[PDB]
């Protein structure tokens, strides 16, 4: 919440690529977990299927043809390599963390996607014109103004209570 108020950190598209990598990374962990467990082969008579595997097997324990027929016919588009799949599970969480960590070297020197200009122009010439974007800037100056008296105690911010921006009744 420091980098939200002062830096508008969710708006940085380097961070948006990071969220897509981490949510897409937890996506691929949930998919490939589920499809392998569910295209498994009968390798025993136990209802438990975990005991029907030994690590030294030469065969596959889930039907890659069946799993490809599943998602191609449900989602429309499916994998057909185990080598390309598992590189893609390597690739997506990792390149989320790189592109996100490029943008945090943005704020280190305060070059940041803070505002859109023409979006912020037209608001200052039309008091009719409100977006969710301008709603976020008012929330950002809530975080900027209220926290900073107790965020950085060494800089000795003394804020009058008429100075502190505030809505109606709260």
């Amino acid at each position: 919440l420091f980098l939200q108020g002062f830096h508008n950190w969710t708006l940085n598209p380097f961070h948006m690529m990071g969220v897509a990598g981490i949510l897409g990374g937890a996506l691929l962990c949930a998919i490939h977990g589920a499809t392998v467990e569910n295209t498994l082969f009968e390798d025993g008579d136990a209802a438990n299927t975990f005991r029907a595997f030994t690590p030294t097997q030469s065969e596959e324990t889930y039907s890659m043809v069946t799993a490809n027929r599943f998602w191609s016919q449900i989602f429309g588009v499916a994998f057909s390599n185990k080598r390309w799949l598992h590189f893609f599970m390597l690739f997506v969480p990792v390149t989320g963390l790189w592109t996100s960590s490029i943008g945090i070297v943005g704020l280190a020197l305060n070059l940041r996607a803070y505002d859109f200009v023409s979006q912020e122009l037209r608001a200052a010439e039309d008091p009719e014109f409100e977006t969710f974007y301008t709603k976020n800037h008012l929330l950002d100056e809530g975080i900027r103004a209220w926290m900073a008296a107790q965020d950085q105690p060494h800089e000795n911010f003394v804020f009058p209570e008429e100075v502190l921006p505030r809505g109606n009744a709260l």
Partner: peptide, 30 residues
Amino acid sequence: MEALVYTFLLIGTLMVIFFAVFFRETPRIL
């Protein structure tokens, strides 16, 4: 005039997905 550029790219991705589902390279067992 940038709402043209916005809707060209959004429909642009929607076109690419349509070719990616229905004109895909099919995998073969052979």
